[PDB]
Amino acid sequence: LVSGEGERFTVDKKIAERSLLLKNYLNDMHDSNVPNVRSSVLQKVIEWAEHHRDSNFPDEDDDDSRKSAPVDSWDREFLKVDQEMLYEIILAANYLNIKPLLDAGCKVVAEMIRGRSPEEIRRTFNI
Amino acid sequence: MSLNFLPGRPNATPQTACQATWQNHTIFAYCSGNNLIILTNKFTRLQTIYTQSDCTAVDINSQNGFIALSFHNRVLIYKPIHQIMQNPKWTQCCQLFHDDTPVNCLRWSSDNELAIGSDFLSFWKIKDNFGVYQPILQWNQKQPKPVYNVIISQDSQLIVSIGKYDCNAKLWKRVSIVGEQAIFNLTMLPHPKPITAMRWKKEPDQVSKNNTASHALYTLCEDKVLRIWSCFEMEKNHTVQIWGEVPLSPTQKFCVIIDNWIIRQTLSVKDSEIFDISDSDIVILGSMTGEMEVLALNNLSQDPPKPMTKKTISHKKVKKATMLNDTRYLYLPEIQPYDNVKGKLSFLVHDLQGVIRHLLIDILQLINNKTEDLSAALEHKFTGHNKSVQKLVRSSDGEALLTTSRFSENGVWYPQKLNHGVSLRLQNTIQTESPIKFAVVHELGKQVICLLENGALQAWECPTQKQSYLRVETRLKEEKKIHPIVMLNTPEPKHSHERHFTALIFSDGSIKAFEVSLTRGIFEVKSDSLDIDGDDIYKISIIDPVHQTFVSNRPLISLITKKGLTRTYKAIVNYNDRHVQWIKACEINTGIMNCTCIRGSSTGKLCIVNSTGKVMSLWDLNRGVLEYEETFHNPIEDIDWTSTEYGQSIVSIGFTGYALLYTQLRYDYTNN
């Protein structure tokens, strides 16, 4: 439920049910019956889940949605904190099968890389 | 490269700077304290000459490129070590000493002739033996008072002097036709007010005979009146009469002259047809407001007498930096063409506030009657630090610099973007009771915090005059067992400008986290001491971006120990708790035990010079892997890392006299 490298957190909550992996691996259906994620990025993911605890997403049933839309500004600033850690945050959101964080991370990193091209550098950095 | 110099603050002497067109190399020279500064090739190269005395005046020989430099009761003459070459260089060649009077003003003339006026207006020549250049005091005479300004023409017209606040210019013509000990004939040239400036007209084509008339003399009287005095040989019968008058309007405060020489060298025959003013020289009258009027004289140099008059050409107006920065006086060395760059005139300004300005006015635009505002653009600016720089401290936003010395002459500068690269611009001076051992700049330079070797932590506000108003101060106990080694501005978890929690690293641990602020006094914070890694910090180096990034999550100090156990430590602090915590963000164990230099970037890179100092090792902090290793024939004196919000990291490895710049190169899939 928490990374072994000194990682701990709330064992379960409405937030932890946000991860579709934990929808089955969090003792879900206990009557009928995390290792990989790095500690810091685990903290970051649970922070995002807690923040959006009071939100709703169309999940994979968004069809035309789930993409081709601007990302939430708070998510933009929250994820835009480290270039090297964003890829492993995307990987964590992938392993936990959490679609919204995956989509947000991909949007943010795509815009970072697009904005690092020399044309965009000159058009937005110095000009 | 676009390398801009700051050679040294110029003096306030009228002749403290002179531009000169020796062989069209357009030399420039000026005096700065105990130094002479000579800028040779389009001001892209510099030569400085050190003399143990304040330099009074400097002048340059147009004919042969010799420099005459006044100081104390003597003068020095320097000559191009090689008379012709693409990269000229000056070396000491001769000495001049006449009496015990400081040489207040000095100039140069044809064939090694000098008018070295101190209080007596000594006249000399130096060019003998097989290259001894032994001088000959061909004349000597006394004056009513020390010479504030002198001028010398070529040939018979000889010399003129004024003296400070003088209302009559002593013209001394070369009275004697022959003989080394020539006696000079006097004339008074009364003026209605003290002379503000003066200069001879130019006519180098008359050489080598030099026997020519119409040596007109320009002289500005204190009564806002420019005056042109006619001159002729006429068996020495001419002249002490004013040939033309030009009263400046009350708005006008400054005046300058562009000789027919420059116009003839710049404008082509087809272009000369309009406005068709090539028959005489040009005069530009400007005001502090920027507005200026340019006019052309009528037959100002005609050999037969002519009815000289002022004929207007254009009414221009350039920005503030194009005319004057609200200075008390301006000394404007002769405007000359910028070498072979046709159509450009190297206008210079001496602001008497530590700054010389080089403008490169475009003549065709200047005389354009149907023209808009002036197009002059700041090309170079020359200044310098007062005494010396012991260290340079950079604001992490990179927009402010603090120059610190062994003395209290500390300065706060800001980078300034010129038309030619970038140059620094002194904005404030941080007066201190004692040398600053460490410091950190904030608020885009408007607030400064410093720690003195005396142990006092002082906080200044620099909102504007150049005065820096000390707003807060406190002192330490100076236990003389542990000592500070760096000051880290631990960012607050949130962007906060009210207070700047500065951490003093007292060698092994003991982080004195003062909650320094200006609106409220300095404080103290207990938490916390980091792992000193052996009770002795070995060559800690700060980590800082050089761009306006507000991120608080960042490693601040890349500590290292003689065992090579480098460790980058993050900074976390709580304002409410009044305590700070040190977190080891990375602990890459380096393979080098003793390191000459260490530094790291915002992007998780790191650089270490070995103990020998001749090998540079570039390491990745996010992987602990040596990415690069190079061997240099010379020791690595320093290292410094830039960055940008786009990860454009660059590392400058500063060697003895030159600095290499290295940048990351993409890993090539199908190559080495």
Curated annotation (Swiss-Prot), chain A:
Pathway: Protein modification; protein ubiquitination. It is found in: Cytoplasm; Nucleus; Chromosome, Centromere, Kinetochore. InterPro entries: SKP1, SKP1-like, SKP1-like_dim_sf, SKP1/BTB/POZ_sf, Skp1_comp_dimer, Skp1_comp_POZ. GO terms for biological process: cellular response to methylmercury; exit from mitosis; G1/S transition of mitotic cell cycle; G2/M transition of mitotic cell cycle; kinetochore assembly; mitochondrial fusion; mitotic cell cycle; mitotic intra-S DNA damage checkpoint signaling. One of its GO terms (molecular function) is DNA replication origin binding. It comes from the Eukaryota. Residues 90-127 are annotated as: Interaction with the F-box domain of F-box proteins. Keywords: Centromere, Chromosome, Cytoplasm, DNA-binding, Kinetochore, Nucleus, Phosphoprotein, Ubl conjugation pathway. One of its GO terms (cellular component) is RAVE complex. Component of the E3 ubiquitin ligase complexes SCF with HRT1, some cullins like CDC53, and some F-box proteins like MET30 CDC4 and SAF1. Interacts with CDC53 and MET30 to form the E3 ubiquitin ligase complex SCF(Met30) which also contains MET4. Forms complex SCF(Cdc4) together with CDC4 and CDC53. Component of the CBF3 complex, which is formed of CBF3A/CBF2, CBF3B/CEP3, CBF3C/CTF13 and CBF3D. Component of the RAVE complex composed of RAV1, RAV2 and SKP1/CBF3D. Interacts with RCY1, ROY1, CBF3D and SGT1. Belongs to the SKP1 family. Essential component of the E3 ubiquitin ligase complex SCF (SKP1-CUL1-F-box protein) ubiquitin ligase complex, which mediates the ubiquitination and subsequent proteasomal degradation of target proteins like phosphorylated SIC1. Participates in the attachment of chromosomes to the spindle. Acts as a regulatory component of the centromere DNA-binding protein complex CBF3, which is essential for chromosome segregation and movement of centromeres along microtubules. CBF3 is required for the recruitment of other kinetochore complexes to CEN DNA. This is Suppressor of kinetochore protein 1. It comes from Saccharomyces cerevisiae (strain ATCC 204508 / S288c) (Baker's yeast). The gene is SKP1.
From Swiss-Prot, chain B:
It is found in: Endomembrane system. It comes from the Eukaryota. WD repeats lie at residues 98-134, 142-182, 190-239, 384-423, 431-464, 588-629, 631-672. Disulfide bonds: none annotated. Component of the RAVE complex composed of RAV1, RAV2 and CBF3D/SKP1. Within the complex, it interacts directly with RAV2 and CBF3D. Interacts with the V-ATPase V1 subunits VMA1, VMA2 and VMA8. Present with 149 molecules/cell in log phase SD medium. Component of the RAVE complex, which is required for stable assembly of the vacuolar ATPase complex V-ATPase under many conditions. Required for transport between the early endosome and the late endosome/prevacuolar compartment (PVC), suggesting that assembly of vacuolar ATPase at the early endosome is required for transport from the early endosome to the PVC. This is Regulator of V-ATPase in vacuolar membrane protein 1. The gene is RAV1. The chain holds residues 1 to 679 of 1357 of the full protein.
